Amino acid sequence: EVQVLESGGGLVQPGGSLRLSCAASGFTFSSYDMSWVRQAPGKGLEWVSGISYSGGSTYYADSVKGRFTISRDNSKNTLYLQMNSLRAEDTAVYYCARDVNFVPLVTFDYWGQGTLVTVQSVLTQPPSASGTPGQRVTLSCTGSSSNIGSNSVTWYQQLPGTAPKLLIYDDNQRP
Amino acid sequence: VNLTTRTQLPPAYTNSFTRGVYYPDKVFRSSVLHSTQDLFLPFFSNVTWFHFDNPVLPFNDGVYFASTSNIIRGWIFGTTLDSKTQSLLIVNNATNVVIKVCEFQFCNDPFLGSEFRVYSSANNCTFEYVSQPFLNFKNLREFVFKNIDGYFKIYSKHTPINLVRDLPQGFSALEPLVDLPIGINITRFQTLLALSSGWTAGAAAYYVGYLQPRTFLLKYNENGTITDAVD
Amino acid sequence: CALDPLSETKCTLKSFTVEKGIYQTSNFRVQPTESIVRFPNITNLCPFGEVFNATRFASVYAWNRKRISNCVADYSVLYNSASFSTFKCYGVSPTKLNDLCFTNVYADSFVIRGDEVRQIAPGQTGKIADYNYKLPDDFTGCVIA
Amino acid sequence: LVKNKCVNFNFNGLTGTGVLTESNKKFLPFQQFGRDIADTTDAVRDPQTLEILDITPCSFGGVSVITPGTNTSNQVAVLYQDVNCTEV
Numbered sequence: 001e002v003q004v005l006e007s008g009g010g011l012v013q014p015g016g017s018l019r020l021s022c023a024a025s026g027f028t029f030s031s032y033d034m035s036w037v038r039q040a041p042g043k044g045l046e047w048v049s050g051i052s053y054s055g056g057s058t059y060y061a062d063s064v065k066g067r068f069t070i071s072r073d074n075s076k077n078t079l080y081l082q083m084n085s086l087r088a089e090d091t092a093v094y095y096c097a098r099d100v101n102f103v104p105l106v107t108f109d110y111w112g113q114g115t116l117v118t119v120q121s122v123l124t125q126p127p128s129a130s131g132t133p134g135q136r137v138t139l140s141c142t143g144s145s146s147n148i149g150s151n152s153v154t155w156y157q158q159l160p161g162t163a164p165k166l167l168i169y170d171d172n173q174r175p
Numbered sequence: 176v177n178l179t180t181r182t183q184l185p186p187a188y189t190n191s192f193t194r195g196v197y198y199p200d201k202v203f204r205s206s207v208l209h210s211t212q213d214l215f216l217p218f219f220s221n222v223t224w225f226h227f228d229n230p231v232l233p234f235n236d237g238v239y240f241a242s243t244s245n246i247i248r249g250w251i252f253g254t255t256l257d258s259k260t261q262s263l264l265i266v267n268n269a270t271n272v273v274i275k276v277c278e279f280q281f282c283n284d285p286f287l288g289s290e291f292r293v294y295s296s297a298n299n300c301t302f303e304y305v306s307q308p309f310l311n312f313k314n315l316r317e318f319v320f321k322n323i324d325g326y327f328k329i330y331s332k333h334t335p336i337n338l339v340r341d342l343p344q345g346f347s348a349l350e351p352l353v354d355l356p357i358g359i360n361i362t363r364f365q366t367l368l369a370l371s372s373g374w375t376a377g378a379a380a381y382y383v384g385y386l387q388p389r390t391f392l393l394k395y396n397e398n399g400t401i402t403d404a405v406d
Numbered sequence: 407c408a409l410d411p412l413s414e415t416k417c418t419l420k421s422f423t424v425e426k427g428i429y430q431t432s433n434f435r436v437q438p439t440e441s442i443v444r445f446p447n448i449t450n451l452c453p454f455g456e457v458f459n460a461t462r463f464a465s466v467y468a469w470n471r472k473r474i475s476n477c478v479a480d481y482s483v484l485y486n487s488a489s490f491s492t493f494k495c496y497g498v499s500p501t502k503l504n505d506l507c508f509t510n511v512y513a514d515s516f517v518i519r520g521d522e523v524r525q526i527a528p529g530q531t532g533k534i535a536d537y538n539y540k541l542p543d544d545f546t547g548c549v550i551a
Numbered sequence: 552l553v554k555n556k557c558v559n560f561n562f563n564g565l566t567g568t569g570v571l572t573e574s575n576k577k578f579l580p581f582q583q584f585g586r587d588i589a590d591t592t593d594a595v596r597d598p599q600t601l602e603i604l605d606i607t608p609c610s611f612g613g614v615s616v617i618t619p620g621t622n623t624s625n626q627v628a629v630l631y632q633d634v635n636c637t638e639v
């Protein structure tokens with residue numbers, strides 16, 4: 001079991017603060033990078049932030065840059081997102097994803113169940129693709145030389161109403 | 176094959192009067208009569224007197240060494256050796272003692288002359304130290320080698336003396352010199368001497384006493400040095 | 407039995423009238439203001455550079471192995487180093503690495519492919535783990551890529 | 552290193568509670584602990600700077616109370632046995 005529970009989501013108001021905490025057990029939480037990812041209700045995944053194995057390097061999405069602080073306490077093996085000066089666009093469901101590999105070849109395998117917090121995408125993946133049983137459907141991501149060309153492409157399959165699931169990592173392999 | 180010069184010589188014995196007392200621990204005591212049970216060399220004991228003669232010797236419970244021109248260079252502690260098992264080898268060619276628990280290939284003949292041919296080469300080393308040099312007759316160097324808890328500890332003291340045979344009278348406690356976390360078992364040892372087949376030898380005597388689980392009574396003086404002992 | 411020195415006397419003698427005299431009520435001891443953990447200044451730092459900062463690493467099939475002992479090693483410097491992209495510790499936790507002691511350390515140094523780094527975890531299979539450098543599932547160590 | 556304060560020192564593996572004071576005890580260049588006839592740690596050599604400190608057990612003892620008869624008066628004096636005047 002490499003489960004990662006998460007909590008700290010509830011009704012808040014714009015311009016406030018909220019502490020999200022997710023606890024990871026079953027693996028060396030202090031050796032794997034982790035991240036916070038966000039899914040607006042009925043909208044694609046938006047990666048909030050990410051913190052390294054040591055907690056020294058922190059990365060934030062420019063949509064939330066300068067107002068969210070990602071933190072990691074390895075003693076209790078828990079990881080926090082401190083949301084400050086919230087906006088109306090931040091009402092979503094939050095997951096904390098374990099990063100299998102180092103950056104840049106990020107790989108999110110295990111995801112939290114989802115905390116419902118109430119308060120554009122670089123990769124121009126098609127809005128939808130229709131398939132038929134027994135067909136061979138190619139759904140194609142698209143990015144720049146910095147997104148797709150240089151770093152691994154990982155594919156997540158999110159069933160309706162569940163956490164995302166890793167399908168493809170390092171451009172070729174499967175879990 | 177050993178040296179071309181192995182004349183027959185019986186293991187002459189002598190009497191270690193009060194020698195072989197070493198500070199059993201790093202504890203300081205002032206004007207105290209401490210009664211500790213540890214491995215000491217028994218008082219007035221029959222210690223073997225080897226004289227160029229270094230036959231293999233057992234290391235059952237640690238052994239006391241008494242060495243009276245820097246002829247001895249070190250010792251070769253082993254159990255099976257022959258590149259089969261690692262062994263402790265110490266070499267002091269010139270004020271340069273080196274500690275190597277390595278998979279040595281030492282040939283029973285520790286040929287030497289300067290010339291060194293004690294062991295062809297050392298492979299699979301686990302510990303390597305390059306510490307400062309540990310080393311009528313003028314200088315008497317007394318050592319105590321002991322194996323507790325895998326730790327290999329050497330107590331030692333170098334004393335200016337005037338003697339030609341046997342061990343001098345008087346009392347001198349062997350200060351701890353260095354502790355080695357070798358962690359390996361040991362039962363046998365050797366010695367190393369400066370003196371390609373017709374090699375001479377130099378005047379050098381070394382005496383081997385055997386530590387036993389004795390109870391002693393050490394007289395730490397005001398300055399903490401052990402000035403006298405009764406077993 | 408806690409407000410007056412007299413009350414402690416009334417309480418030790420179990421009487422409400424205390425006769426004239428001196429009574430040993432309780433005992434006191436000045437408490438440790440703090441703790442002073444003190445050790446000898448570091449004297450035998452380990453040269454991680456000899457393996458890490460080495461100018462020429464080894465091929466993964468013929469991976470170098472360097473023995474580390476007779477030494478003190480600060481793994482926190484390595485863990486808190488930004489050069490390392492991967493620091494995966496199995497069987498131990500990197501935060502407690504400085505707390506523990508081992509008989510010896512082995513630095514197994516080699517060069518692999520990026521897509522191949524995930525093959526240096528215990529229980530992994532492939533062409534590096536199965537064929538080049540295998541780690542037991544009962545692994546007590548770390549991997550630094 | 553703090554001197555003249557009751558502290559929980561942990562010199563190497565040797566731990567203990569007491570007040571540390573600089574001293575004139577002449578430890579031999581290889582000695583770390585100091586001890587007395589009672590086999591109690593008296594002095595320690597500071598591991599990282601070669602100095603000799605005595606471990607005086609912190610001021611401790613009984614707390615006697617000097618009182619006249621309770622019927623006579625409620626006033627009370629306190630005797631902290633074998634301790635210097637520290638905290639009043």
Ligand SMILES: *[C@@H]1O[C@H](CO)[C@@H](O)[C@H](O)[C@H]1NC(C)=O
Nearest residue numbers: 188189190191219220221222
């Ligand atoms: C040591 O043994 C030898 C040979 O038996 C003997 O002559 C000598 O008196 C003994 N000396 C001691 C110290 O017992």
Ligand SMILES: *[C@@H]1O[C@H](CO)[C@@H](O)[C@H](O)[C@H]1NC(C)=O
Nearest residue numbers: 260261277278299300301359
């Ligand atoms: C090397 O020496 C060690 C000493 O413990 C021994 O266990 C081991 O079998 C030897 N062989 C190698 C190459 O490690």
Ligand SMILES: *[C@@H]1O[C@H](CO)[C@@H](O)[C@H](O)[C@H]1NC(C)=O
Nearest residue numbers: 395396397398399400402577
């Ligand atoms: C301790 O050393 C001093 C010199 O510092 C010396 O005078 C004294 O005799 C020594 N101890 C004894 C035996 O009293």
Ligand SMILES: *[C@@H]1O[C@H](CO)[C@@H](O)[C@H](O)[C@H]1NC(C)=O
Nearest residue numbers: 453454455456457458459487
């Ligand atoms: C390697 O060299 C860099 C140069 O900045 C240094 O910071 C680092 O500590 C070195 N690492 C090792 C393991 O020697």
Ligand SMILES: *[C@@H]1O[C@H](CO)[C@@H](O)[C@H](O)[C@H]1NC(C)=O
Nearest residue numbers: 446447448449598599600601
């Ligand atoms: C140990 O470090 C201390 C503090 O810097 C210094 O005062 C002392 O001289 C050093 N001693 C050694 C063992 O080099």
